[PDB]
Symmetry: C15
Subunit: 82 residues, 15 copies
Amino acid sequence: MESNLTTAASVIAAALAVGIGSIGPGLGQGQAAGQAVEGIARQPEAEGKIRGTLLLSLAFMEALTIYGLVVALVLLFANPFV
Amino acid sequence: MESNLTTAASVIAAALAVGIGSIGPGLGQGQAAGQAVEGIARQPEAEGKIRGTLLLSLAFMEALTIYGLVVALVLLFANPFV
Amino acid sequence: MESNLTTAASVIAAALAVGIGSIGPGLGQGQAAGQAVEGIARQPEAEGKIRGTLLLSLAFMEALTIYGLVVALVLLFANPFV
Amino acid sequence: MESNLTTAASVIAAALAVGIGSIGPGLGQGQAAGQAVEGIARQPEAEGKIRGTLLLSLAFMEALTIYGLVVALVLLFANPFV
Amino acid sequence: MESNLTTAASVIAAALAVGIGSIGPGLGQGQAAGQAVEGIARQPEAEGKIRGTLLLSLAFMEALTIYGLVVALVLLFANPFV
Amino acid sequence: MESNLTTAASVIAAALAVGIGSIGPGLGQGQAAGQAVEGIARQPEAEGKIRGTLLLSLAFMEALTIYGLVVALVLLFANPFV
Amino acid sequence: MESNLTTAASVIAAALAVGIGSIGPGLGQGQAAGQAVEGIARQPEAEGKIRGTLLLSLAFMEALTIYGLVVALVLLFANPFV
Amino acid sequence: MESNLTTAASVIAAALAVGIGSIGPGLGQGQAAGQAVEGIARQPEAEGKIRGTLLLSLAFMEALTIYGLVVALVLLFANPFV
Amino acid sequence: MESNLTTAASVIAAALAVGIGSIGPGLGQGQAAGQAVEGIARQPEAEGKIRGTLLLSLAFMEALTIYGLVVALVLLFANPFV
Amino acid sequence: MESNLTTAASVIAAALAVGIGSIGPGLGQGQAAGQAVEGIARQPEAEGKIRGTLLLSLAFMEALTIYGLVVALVLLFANPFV
Amino acid sequence: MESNLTTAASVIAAALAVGIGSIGPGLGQGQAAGQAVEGIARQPEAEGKIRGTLLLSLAFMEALTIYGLVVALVLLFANPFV
Amino acid sequence: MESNLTTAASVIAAALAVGIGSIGPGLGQGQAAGQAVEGIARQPEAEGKIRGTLLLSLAFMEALTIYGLVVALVLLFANPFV
Amino acid sequence: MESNLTTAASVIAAALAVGIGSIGPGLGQGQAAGQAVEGIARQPEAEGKIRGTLLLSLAFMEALTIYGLVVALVLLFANPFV
Amino acid sequence: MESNLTTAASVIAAALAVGIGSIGPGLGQGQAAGQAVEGIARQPEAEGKIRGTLLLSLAFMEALTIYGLVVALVLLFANPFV
Amino acid sequence: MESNLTTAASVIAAALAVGIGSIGPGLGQGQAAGQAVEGIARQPEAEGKIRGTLLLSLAFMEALTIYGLVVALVLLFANPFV
Ligand SMILES: OC[C@H]1O[C@H](O[C@H]2[C@H](O)[C@@H](O)[C@H](OCCCCC3CCCCC3)O[C@@H]2CO)[C@H](O)[C@@H](O)[C@@H]1O
Ligand SMILES: OC[C@H]1O[C@H](O[C@H]2[C@H](O)[C@@H](O)[C@H](OCCCCC3CCCCC3)O[C@@H]2CO)[C@H](O)[C@@H](O)[C@@H]1O
Ligand SMILES: OC[C@H]1O[C@H](O[C@H]2[C@H](O)[C@@H](O)[C@H](OCCCCC3CCCCC3)O[C@@H]2CO)[C@H](O)[C@@H](O)[C@@H]1O
Ligand SMILES: OC[C@H]1O[C@H](O[C@H]2[C@H](O)[C@@H](O)[C@H](OCCCCC3CCCCC3)O[C@@H]2CO)[C@H](O)[C@@H](O)[C@@H]1O
Ligand SMILES: OC[C@H]1O[C@H](O[C@H]2[C@H](O)[C@@H](O)[C@H](OCCCCC3CCCCC3)O[C@@H]2CO)[C@H](O)[C@@H](O)[C@@H]1O
Ligand SMILES: OC[C@H]1O[C@H](O[C@H]2[C@H](O)[C@@H](O)[C@H](OCCCCC3CCCCC3)O[C@@H]2CO)[C@H](O)[C@@H](O)[C@@H]1O
Ligand SMILES: OC[C@H]1O[C@H](O[C@H]2[C@H](O)[C@@H](O)[C@H](OCCCCC3CCCCC3)O[C@@H]2CO)[C@H](O)[C@@H](O)[C@@H]1O
Ligand SMILES: OC[C@H]1O[C@H](O[C@H]2[C@H](O)[C@@H](O)[C@H](OCCCCC3CCCCC3)O[C@@H]2CO)[C@H](O)[C@@H](O)[C@@H]1O
Ligand SMILES: OC[C@H]1O[C@H](O[C@H]2[C@H](O)[C@@H](O)[C@H](OCCCCC3CCCCC3)O[C@@H]2CO)[C@H](O)[C@@H](O)[C@@H]1O
Ligand SMILES: OC[C@H]1O[C@H](O[C@H]2[C@H](O)[C@@H](O)[C@H](OCCCCC3CCCCC3)O[C@@H]2CO)[C@H](O)[C@@H](O)[C@@H]1O
Ligand SMILES: OC[C@H]1O[C@H](O[C@H]2[C@H](O)[C@@H](O)[C@H](OCCCCC3CCCCC3)O[C@@H]2CO)[C@H](O)[C@@H](O)[C@@H]1O
Ligand SMILES: OC[C@H]1O[C@H](O[C@H]2[C@H](O)[C@@H](O)[C@H](OCCCCC3CCCCC3)O[C@@H]2CO)[C@H](O)[C@@H](O)[C@@H]1O
Ligand SMILES: OC[C@H]1O[C@H](O[C@H]2[C@H](O)[C@@H](O)[C@H](OCCCCC3CCCCC3)O[C@@H]2CO)[C@H](O)[C@@H](O)[C@@H]1O
Ligand SMILES: OC[C@H]1O[C@H](O[C@H]2[C@H](O)[C@@H](O)[C@H](OCCCCC3CCCCC3)O[C@@H]2CO)[C@H](O)[C@@H](O)[C@@H]1O
Ligand SMILES: OC[C@H]1O[C@H](O[C@H]2[C@H](O)[C@@H](O)[C@H](OCCCCC3CCCCC3)O[C@@H]2CO)[C@H](O)[C@@H](O)[C@@H]1O
C-alpha cells in the first residue's frame, strides 16, 4: 500500500480528467444528435447522408473525453511517479 | 480496515467522477431525445429512422459517463495505491 | 463507532455523487418529456411512437444518476477501506 | 451525545444529498409540466394521452431526488460509521 | 445548552436542506403555472383539465422541497447524534 | 447571554434558510404572475378562471419559502441545542 | 456593549437575510409588472382586472422578502442569544 | 474608538445589505419601466393607466432595497451590541 | 493614523456599498432607457409621455444606488465606531 | 511611506469601487445607445428627440459609476483614517 | 526600493481597476457599435446622425474605464501612502 | 516511488490540461456538426461540400484539445523536473 | 535580481491587467464586426460608411484594453516600488 | 530530481496556459464553422468563397491557443528559472 | 536554478495572461467570422468587401491576445526582477 501526496493527487486527477472531460463533449453530442434527428424528420430521404456525417462528428467529440480517460488510466495503472 | 489521505481522496475522487461526469451527457441526452419525439410527431412515418439514429447518439453520450463509472469502480474495487 | 477522515469523506462523497449526479439528467429528462407532450398534442395519433421513444430516452438518463446511486451505496455498505 | 467529524459530515452530507439533488429534477418537472398543460390547451381531446405520458416522466425525475433522500435517510437512521 | 461541531453542522445543514432545496421547485412551478394561466386564456373551456394536471405537477414539485424539510425536521427534532 | 459555535451557526443558518429560500419562489411567482396578467389582457372574459389558478400556484410557491421561515424560527425561538 | 462571535454573526446574518432575500422577489416583481403594463397597453379596457391580479401577485412576492426582514429584526432587536 | 470584531462585522454587514439588496430590484424596476414605455408608445391614450400601475410596481420594488437600507441604518445608528 | 480592523473593514465596506450597489440599477436604467428611445422612434408624437414616464423610473433606480452611496459616506465621514 | 492594514484595504477598496462599479453602467449604456442608433435609422426624423432622451439616460447611468470614483478619490485624497 | 503590504496591494489594485474596469464598457461599446452599423446599412442616408449619436455614446462608456485608469495611475505615480 | 510537490502538481496539471481543454472544442464541434446535419437535410445535394468543410473545422477544433493531451503526455512521460 | 512580495504581486498584477482587460473588449469587437459584415452583405453599396464607423468603434474598444497593457508595462519596466 | 516551488508552479502554469487558452477559440471556431456549413447549404455555388474565408478565420483563432501552447512549451523545455 | 516566490509567480502569471487573454477574442473572432460567412452566402458578389472588413476586424481582436503574449514573453525572457 502507498499513501503520499502524489498517490492522492493522482486519484483526484484521474477523476477530474474524465468528470470535467465529459462536460463539453457531453453537451456537444446532444446538440448534433438533436439536429440530425430533426433533419431526419425533415428529409427522410436524406437519412443515410445525415447518419453518416453525425457519426463522423460523434467520433471527434468522444475522442476528446477519451484523452481524459487515457490520462486517468496512466495515473492509476501506468503511474510514472507512484 | 485502512485510513489515510489517499483513501480519503479515493472516495471523493470516486463521487466526483461519476457525479460531475453526468452533467454534460445528461443535458445532451435530453436535447437529443426532445428533438427526436418532436421529430416523430412531425413525421410519424419516419419513427424508425429517428429511433435508430437516436439510439446511436444516446450510446456515445452514455459511454462518456461510463468512463467516469469505470474510474470510480477502479478507485473502489481495484485501487492501485490503497 | 469509528470516525477517521475516510468515514467523513465517505459520507460527503456519497451525498455529492447522488446529488450532483442528478442535475444534468434531471434537467435533460424534463427537456425530453416537454417535447414529448408538445408532440402528443400536435399528433395524438403518434402518441405510442412518441411514448415509446421517450420511455427509452428516460431510461438512458435515469442510468446516469443510478451510477451515482451505486457509488453511494458501495461507499455506505461495501466500503473498501473503512 | 457523540460529536466526532463523521457525525458532523453526516448531517451536512444528508442535507447536501437532497438540497442539491432537487435542483435538477425541480427545473425538469416544471419544464415538462408546463409543456403538458400548454399542449392540453391547444389540444384538449388529447388530455388523457398528455396527462398520462406526463405522469410517467414525472415519476422518473422524482426518483432522481428520492435517491438523494434515500442516502440522507441512511446517513441518518442507518449510519454505517457513527 | 450543548454545543459541538455536530450541533453546529446540524443547524447549518437544516437550513441548507430547506433553503437550497427551494431553488429548483420554485422555478419549476412558476414555469408550469405560467403555462397554465396562458393556456387557460387560450382555451378557457379547458380550464378544468388544465387546472387538474397543473395541480398534479405542483404536487410532484412540492414534494421535492418537502424532502428537504423532512431532513431539516429530523436534524432538529430527532437528531440521531446529538 | 450565550455565545458558542452553535448559537453563531444558528443565526447564520436562520438567515440563509430564508435568503436562499426565497430565490426560486421569488423568480417562480414573477413568472406565473406575468403570464396571468398577459392572459387576462388576452381573454378578459377568462379572468376569474385565471385569477383562480394563479392563486393556487402562488400558494404552492410561497409554501417553499415558508419552510425556510419555519426552520429559521425553530432556530431562534425553539432551538433544540442552544 | 457586547462583542463575541455570536454577535458578529448576528449582524452578518441580518444583512444576508434582507440582502440575499431580495434578489428573487425583486426580479420576479419586475417581470410581473412589465407584463401588466404591456397588458394594459394592449387592452386598456382591462386595466382594473390587471391592476387587481397584479396587486395580488406583488403581495405574495413582497411577503417573501418580508420574511427575511423579520429574521433580521429579531436578530437585531429580539436576539435569543445575545 | 472601539474596534472589536462586531464593529468590523457591522460595517461590512451594512454595506452588503444595501449593495446586494439593490441587485434584484434594480434589474426588476428596469424590466417594468421598459415595458411601460414600449407600452406608452403603442397606446399613448393608455399613458395614465400604464403610468399609474408602473408607479405602484416601482414602489413595491423600491421597498425591497429599503429594507436593506433600514438594516444598514440600525447597524450604524441603533446597533444593538456595539 | 489609526489602523485597526474596523477602519480597514470600513474602507472596503464603503467601496462594496457602491461598487455592487450599482450593478443592478446600472443594467436596469439601460434596459428602461433603451426601450424608451426605441418607443420614441416608433411613435415620436409620444416623446413627452415616454420621456416623462422614463425620467420617473430613472429616479427610482438611481436611488437604489444612492443608498449605497449614503452608507459609504457615513462609513467615511460620520463613522460610528472609528 | 506609512503601511498598515487600513492603507492596504484603502488602495484595494479604491480600485474595486471604480472597477466593479463600471460593469452595470457599461452594459446598460451600450444597451440604451444600441437602441438609439437603431431608432435613429428607423426614423431619422426623430433623431433630435432620440438623441435628447439618450443623453438623459447616459447621464443617469454615468452618475452611478461616478459615485464609485467619488469614494475612490475620498479614500485616496481625503482618507479619514490614514 | 519599497516592499510592504501597501505597495503590493497598490499594484494589484491598479491592475484590477482597469481589468475589471473594461468589462462592462467593453461589452457595452460592442453592442452600440453593432447596432449603428446595422442601422447604417438600413438607412445609409442616416449615417451622419447615427455616427454622431454613436460617438456621444462611445464617449460616456470609455469614460467609465478611464476612471479606473485614473485610479491606477494615482496608485503607481501619485500614491498617497507609499 | 518518488513523491514531492512537483510530482503532485504534475499529475493534477496533466488532468486539468486534457480535462478543461475539452470544454471549448466539445461545445464548438457539436455546434458545427449540428449545423452540418441540418444543412445536409436542407440541401442533400450539397452533402459532399458540407461534409468536406465540416471535417476541416473538426480537425482545427480537435487540434486545440490535442495540445492539452500533448502537455499531459510530456508531464507524464517526459517530465523535465521529475 | 530582486524578490519580495511586491515584485511577486507586480508580475501577477501585470498578467491580470492584460488578461482580464481583454475579456470585454474582445467580445465587444466580435459583436461590432459581425454586424458590420452582415451589414455589408445586406447593402454592399454602403461598405465604406460601415467600414468607417466600424474603425471608429474598434479603436475605442481596443483602447480599453490598451489601458491594461499600459499598466502592465509600467509594472514591469517602470515600477515605482521595485 | 529537483522539486522546488517554481517547478511545481511551472507544470500547473503550463497546463493552465493551454487548458484555459482553448475555451475561447474552441467555442469560436464551432460558431464560425457552423455558420460556414449552413451557408454552404443555402448557397452551394459559394462553397469556395465560404470555405476560403472560413479557413482564414480558423487560423486566427487557432493561433490564440498556439500562444498558450508556446508558453507551455517554454515553461517545460526552455524554462528560464528551473 | 533559482526558485523564489517571484519565479513561481512569474510562471503562473505568464500562463494566466495568455490563457485568460484568449477567451474574449477567441469568442469574438468566431462571432465575426460566423456573420462573414453567412454574409458571403447571402451576397457572394460582396465577398471581397466582406472578406476585407473581416480581415481587419480579426487583426484588432488578435492584438488583444498578443498583448498577453507580450507580457508572458517579458516575464519569461525579459523579467525585470528575477
Ligand atoms: O509528513 C511526512 C510526509 O510528508 C510528505 O508528504 C506529506 C506532506 O508533507 C503533507 O503536507 C501532506 O498533507 C497535505 C494535504 C494536502 C491535501 C491535498 C488537497 C488537494 C490535492 C490533494 C490533497 O501529506 C503528505 C503525506 O505524504 C511525504 O510525501 C511523505 O513521504 C512523508 O512521510
Ligand atoms: O504530519 C503527520 C503525518 O501525516 C501524514 O499523513 C497525513 C497528512 O500529512 C495530512 O495532511 C492529512 O490531513 C489533511 C486533511 C486534508 C483533507 C483532504 C482534503 C481534500 C481531499 C480529501 C480530504 O492526514 C494524513 C493521514 O495519513 C503521514 O501520516 C505522515 O507521513 C506524517 O508524519
Ligand atoms: O481517528 C484518528 C485518525 O486520524 C486521521 O485523520 C485525521 C486527520 O489527520 C486530520 O487532518 C483530520 O482533520 C482534517 C479536517 C479536514 C476536513 C474534511 C474535508 C473533506 C470532507 C471531510 C472533512 O481529522 C482526522 C481525524 O481522524 C486518519 O485518517 C486515521 O488513520 C486516524 O485513525
Ligand atoms: O470537547 C468538547 C467538544 O468539542 C469537539 O468539537 C470541537 C472541535 O474539536 C473543533 O474542531 C471545533 O472547531 C472547528 C471549527 C469548524 C467550523 C465549522 C465547519 C463546518 C460546519 C460549520 C462550522 O470546535 C468544537 C468545539 O466547539 C467535539 O466535536 C465534541 O465531541 C466535544 O465534546
Ligand atoms: O484530532 C482530534 C479528533 O479528530 C477527529 O475529529 C476532529 C477533527 O480532527 C477536526 O479536524 C475537526 O475540526 C475540523 C473542522 C472540520 C470541518 C468539516 C467540514 C465539512 C464536514 C463537517 C466539518 O474536529 C473534530 C472533533 O472531533 C476525531 O474526533 C478523532 O480522531 C479525534 O478525537
Ligand atoms: O475555545 C473555547 C470554546 O470552544 C468551543 O467552541 C469554540 C471553538 O473551539 C472555536 O473553534 C470557535 O471558533 C471557530 C470559528 C468558526 C467561524 C464559523 C464560520 C462559519 C460558521 C459560523 C462561524 O469558537 C467557539 C466558541 O465557543 C465551545 O463551544 C466553548 O464552550 C468553549 O468555551
Ligand atoms: O480561543 C479563545 C477564546 O475564543 C472564544 O471565542 C472566540 C472564538 O474562539 C474565535 O474563533 C473568534 O474569532 C474567529 C473569527 C472568525 C470571523 C467570523 C467568520 C464568519 C462570521 C463572522 C466573523 O472570536 C471569539 C470571541 O468570542 C471564547 O472567547 C473562549 O471560549 C475561547 O477560549
Ligand atoms: O478588541 C479585542 C476584541 O477581540 C475580539 O475580536 C477579535 C477576534 O478574537 C479575532 O479573531 C479577530 O480576528 C479575526 C479576523 C476575521 C476577519 C473578519 C471577517 C468578517 C468581516 C470582518 C473581519 O480580531 C478581533 C479583534 O478585536 C472580540 O470581538 C472582542 O470582544 C474583544 O474586545
Ligand atoms: O503595528 C504596525 C501596524 O500593524 C497593524 O497591521 C498589521 C496587522 O496586525 C496584520 O494582521 C496585517 O496582516 C494581515 C494580512 C491581511 C491581508 C489583507 C486582507 C484584506 C485587505 C488586503 C489584504 O499586517 C499589518 C502590518 O502591515 C495595524 O493595522 C497598524 O495600526 C499598526 O500600526
Ligand atoms: O489582535 C490584535 C488587534 O486585533 C484587532 O485588529 C487586528 C485583527 O485582530 C487582525 O485579525 C487583523 O488582521 C487579520 C486580517 C483581516 C482581514 C480583513 C478582511 C475584510 C475586512 C478588512 C480586513 O489585523 C488587525 C490589526 O489591528 C484590533 O486592532 C485590536 O483588538 C488588537 O490590537
Ligand atoms: O513582517 C514585518 C513587516 O510587517 C508589515 O507588513 C507585513 C505583514 O506583517 C505581513 O502579514 C504581510 O504578509 C501578508 C501576505 C498577504 C498577501 C496579500 C494577498 C492579497 C492582497 C495583496 C497581498 O507582509 C507584510 C510585509 O511588509 C510591515 O508593513 C513591514 O514594514 C514589516 O517589516
Ligand atoms: O515575516 C518575515 C518577513 O516577511 C516579510 O515579507 C514576507 C511577507 O511577510 C510574507 O507574507 C510573504 O509570503 C506570503 C506569500 C503570499 C503569496 C502571494 C499571494 C498573492 C500575491 C502573490 C503571492 O513573503 C514576504 C517576503 O518579502 C519581510 O521580509 C519582513 O518584514 C518580515 O519579517
Ligand atoms: O524533502 C522532501 C521533498 O519535500 C518538498 O515538498 C514538500 C513541501 O515542502 C510541502 O510544502 C508540501 O506540502 C504542501 C501542500 C500543497 C498542496 C498542493 C497544492 C497545489 C498542487 C496540489 C496540492 O509537501 C512536500 C512533501 O511531500 C520538496 O518539494 C521536494 O523537493 C523535497 O525533496
Ligand atoms: O521554505 C522552504 C523552501 O521554500 C521554497 O519552496 C517551498 C515553498 O516555500 C512552500 O510554500 C511550498 O509549499 C506551499 C504550497 C505551494 C502551493 C502552490 C500553489 C500553486 C503553485 C504550485 C503549488 O513548498 C516548497 C518546497 O520547496 C523553495 O524550495 C526554497 O526557497 C525553500 O527550500
Ligand atoms: O528562496 C528563498 C526566498 O523566500 C521568499 O519567498 C518565499 C516566501 O517567503 C514563502 O511565503 C513562499 O511560500 C508561500 C506560498 C504561496 C504560493 C504562491 C501563490 C501564487 C503563485 C505562486 C505560489 O515561499 C517562498 C520560497 O522562496 C522570497 O521570495 C525570496 O526573496 C527568498 O530568496
